[PDB]
């Protein structure tokens, strides 16, 4: 018996591809753009070990985005809390996420 | 006064793509007499009670009006407005609805669960609940989900007629809809839509736009409110640019014995990483004493220095652990400021250089 | 540190002396000038800096108001007291080469942050 | 086998969502790993395999020997 | 027509704006004052105005200041 009542009861499926569609859904329009960047950066050379601290502050003397140097901050802490932007400085970051469904992204985002 | 009313201040401004949705979950469960369950997402700021809110105060046994169907009919619809976070337990939400319900002059009953809910709702009439922020009715996985499985059970099954319309915050699924947040040309029709009623607008139609593109609802009433207090406290374009302004200037606030104690503390964390209030008071005196220049301080005086830099907003101090062979509890001294403007501020005096 | 080269050792003090009545052969001095032991120091120094780069900063040309402060460090290591009455430094500045009008703007200064 | 398993999900032409997949080139792809991950779920319940971290999900272990 | 066009114009900017700059009104009100003696591209204007930000007084779409 392939038992499928006792199936829903455990977390068959199991960092989250749809559930990170719906963040930057609600978040705002400059919020996006922000998001935006970081991934074609990213995935530009998956071998580029990521964006780093002040190399995502140049990306901001091209295009008006963010305020100053000091917000930075700001905007640092609300990705980490959904799980898309990790940290790991040997500041260099990159997300655990392969490129095979992070061009699908970049579409919906779009 | 024109300046009373201002600062005071069924289809809402900016939002006739969402009210249209969600009549159109009523159409279908009040005429066809159906159970089911609404989920409503989206960041605080959208207008989510305030657009449920209204929908009640139009167009709707104590709390009993008459909704109008688009064909053209009559019901009975029973519409209460319950939260869960001015509730006393999660478990004890089933009593809540129950006494909102039922009329006072009946016998009270008491309510545990689903099969003392359910059976109450079985003779009758179309329930309507609101549960304002259903996020909040977790357990802080088997556990913590219970209230709203539960829930959404009771809003599902036949035979009765009972449907949920909750808003959180960010086959039997709910219907999920994104409140979108409000962008420059959407937060400038809700306050016009808002002040129609004032007979002379003082605002100017250029004032408007920079704030609400510079808030991209709740963050532009606290704007434009403090415009109004501004301008009647000194007695236009450039009121609104005075209220993104009043609400490198932490580093000149400070005096100069205070700039050189921070240098040492951003010194220290550098060549040590973790860094303790101990660790760093040894490494701010050898460091003075190679320049002999001031006095030095002992290390009853030095806690006061770092006390302002922590109520400015400029060193974080917090209760930590070590990592080496003595792990014991310890006050460890951390920052959170930027090393662009901490480069540029001391520069200026030329006074100070191995300081930095 | 990274470049930990060897230790002090009393041999390398013997070789500067070699190195510097060589150079004074060369001359036909028969006594060692103080050229010479600057000359036979500077190959030393040039076989020890091998290792690092040729990226040399040095700046020392500010305002001239720290060469006043290194007047009052003075008086604060023979007694240490920070009134306001200084009827002593003033003896001092003159001496220097300094004038009375810039003296004033810069005890006024230290005043404000009580130094 | 991959004609078989194209040839069976087609045979219900009353689930029109079962057509709908059956139609993209990652078809046989998607079949085989909902089958293999209710067949890892259910070997786990029985005491077969073992898993490593909570947090993880990418190594099993073996505890189940035939004839001993 | 870079090494002193985009100096001596850039100090107009600061001026310009009665602050608010927005980049959908340079393409109709400077494309006939500022553009038409200098022609220059669309895509590299963009860059020379968002490089204003280095010199701390000159700060989406909008240049404030
Ligand atoms: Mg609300």
Excluded at chain 2, 95 to 118: C, R, V
Excluded at chain 2, 290 to 303: G, I, V, Y
Excluded at chain 4, 36 to 41: D, G, K, P, V
Aim: charged share 25%.
């Amino acid at each position: 018996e392939p038992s499928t009542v006792e199936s829903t009861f455990q977390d068959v499926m199991k960092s989250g591809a749809e559930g990170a569609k719906y963040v930057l859904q609600s978040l705002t329009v400059n919020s996006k753009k922000m998001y935006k960047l970081l991934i074609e950066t990213q995935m530009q050379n998956m071998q580029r070990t990521g964006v780093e601290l002040k190399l995502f502050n140049h990306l901001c003397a091209a295009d008006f985005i963010a305020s100053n140097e000091i917000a930075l901050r700001s905007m640092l802490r609300e990705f980490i809390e959904h799980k898309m932007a990790n940290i790991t400085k040997n500041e260099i970051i990159w997300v655990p996420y392969t490129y095979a469904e992070l061009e699908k992204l970049l579409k919906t985002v779009l | 006064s024109i300046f009373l009313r201002t600062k005071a201040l069924g289809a809402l401004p900016a939002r006739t793509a969402e009210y249209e949705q969600v009549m159109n979950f009523l159409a279908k469960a009040i005429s066809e007499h159906r159970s089911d369950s609404l989920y409503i997402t989206g960041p605080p700021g959208t207008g989510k009670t305030a657009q449920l809110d209204m929908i009640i105060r139009q167009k709707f046994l104590q709390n009993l009006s008459w909704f109008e169907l688009p064909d053209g009919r009559l019901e009975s619809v029973a519409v209460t407005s319950i939260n869960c976070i001015s509730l006393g337990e999660p478990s004890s939400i089933f009593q809540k609805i129950f006494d909102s319900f039922q009329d006072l002059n009946g016998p009270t009953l008491q309510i545990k669960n689903m099969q003392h809910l359910q059976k109450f709702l079985e003779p009758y009439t179309t329930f309507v609940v609101v549960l304002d922020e259903m996020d909040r009715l977790l357990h802080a996985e088997t556990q913590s989900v219970r209230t709203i499985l539960e829930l959404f059970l009771l809003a599902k099954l036949p035979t009765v007629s009972f449907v949920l319309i909750g808003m959180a915050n960010s086959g039997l699924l709910p219907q999920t809809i994104v409140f979108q947040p409000y962008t420059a040309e959407q937060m400038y029709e809700i306050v016009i839509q808002k002040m129609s009623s004032l007979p002379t607008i003082i605002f100017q139609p250029m004032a408007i736009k920079f704030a609400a593109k510079k808030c991209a609802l709740r963050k532009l009433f606290d704007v434009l409110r403090g415009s109004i207090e501004i301008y009647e406290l000194e007695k236009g374009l450039n009121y609104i640019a005075k209220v993104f302004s009043k609400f490198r200037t932490r580093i000149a606030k400070l005096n100069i014995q205070q700039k050189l104690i921070l240098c040492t503390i951003i010194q220290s964390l550098k060549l040590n990483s973790d860094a303790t209030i101990d660790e760093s008071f040894d490494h701010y005196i050898k460091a003075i004493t190679k320049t002999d220049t001031l006095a030095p301080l002992q290390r009853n005086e030095f806690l006061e220095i770092c006390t302002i830099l922590e109520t400015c907003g400029l060193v974080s101090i917090k209760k930590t652990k070590c990592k080496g062979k003595t792990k014991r509890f310890v006050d460890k001294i951390d920052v959170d400021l930027d090393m662009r403007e901490f480069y540029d501020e001391m520069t200026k005096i030329s006074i100070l250089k191995p300081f930095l | 540190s990274k470049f930990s080269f060897g230790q002090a050792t009393p041999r390398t003090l013997l070789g500067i002396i070699r190195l510097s009545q060589a150079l004074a052969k060369l001359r036909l001095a028969d006594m060692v000038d103080i050229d010479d032991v600057e000359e036979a120091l500077r190959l030393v120094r040039v076989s020890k800096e091998s290792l690092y780069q040729e990226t040399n900063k040095s700046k020392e040309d500010e305002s001239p108001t720290t060469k006043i402060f290194t007047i009052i460090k003075k008086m604060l290591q023979e007694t240490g007291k920070n009134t306001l009455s200084y009827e002593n430094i003033v003896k001092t500045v003159r001496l220097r080469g300094f004038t009375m009008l810039q003296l004033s703007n810069c005890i006024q200064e230290y005043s404000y942050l009580n130094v | 086998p991959k004609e078989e398993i194209l040839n069976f999900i087609r045979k219900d032409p009353s689930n029109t969502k079962l057509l709908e997949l059956a139609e993209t080139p990652d078809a046989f792809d998607k079949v085989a790993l909902i089958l293999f991950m209710q067949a890892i779920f259910a070997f786990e319940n029985m005491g077969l395999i073992k898993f490593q971290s909570t947090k993880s999900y990418d190594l099993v272990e073996k505890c189940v020997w035939r004839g001993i | 027509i870079k090494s002193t066009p985009r100096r001596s114009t850039a100090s107009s900017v600061n001026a310009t704006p009665s602050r608010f700059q927005d980049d959908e009104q340079n393409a109709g009100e400077d494309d006939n004052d500022i553009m038409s003696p200098l022609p220059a591209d669309e895509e590299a204007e963009l860059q020379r105005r968002l490089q204003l930000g280095l010199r701390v007084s000159p700060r989406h779409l909008h240049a404030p200041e």
